[PDB]
């Protein structure tokens, strides 16, 4: 989905990074694949507006 030209490839250390994280629903993407535990994150799971 990304087409970046005009860059060196020993300088591709910097070109392969900057189209990854941007999503407010980065989780509501992931939905139906691979689901995990908040165990150590229960320090921070009383949290905002999920259902309470």
């Amino acid at each position: 989905t990304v087409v970046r030209k005009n860059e060196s490839l020993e300088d591709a250390l910097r070109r392969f990074k900057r189209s990854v994280s941007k999503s407010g629903t980065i989780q509501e993407v992931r939905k139906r694949e691979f689901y995990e535990k908040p165990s150590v994150k229960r320090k921070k799971k009383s949290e905002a507006a999920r259902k309470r």
Binding site: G24, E28, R30, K31, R32, E33, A48, A49
Partner: protein, 54 residues
Amino acid sequence: THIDYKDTELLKRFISERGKILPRRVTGTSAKYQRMLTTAIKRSRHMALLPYVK
């Protein structure tokens, strides 16, 4: 309310083609405005405006 599919006129700043919500403090809202943000937008946002994953 449960704002419907075209009912994202003043909210498509929050809607996305590809998956960006603004959580509570991102809009400074309480537990009715953030709640419509996170539940009522979804009738417009999720069903045919967000491919979750394959």
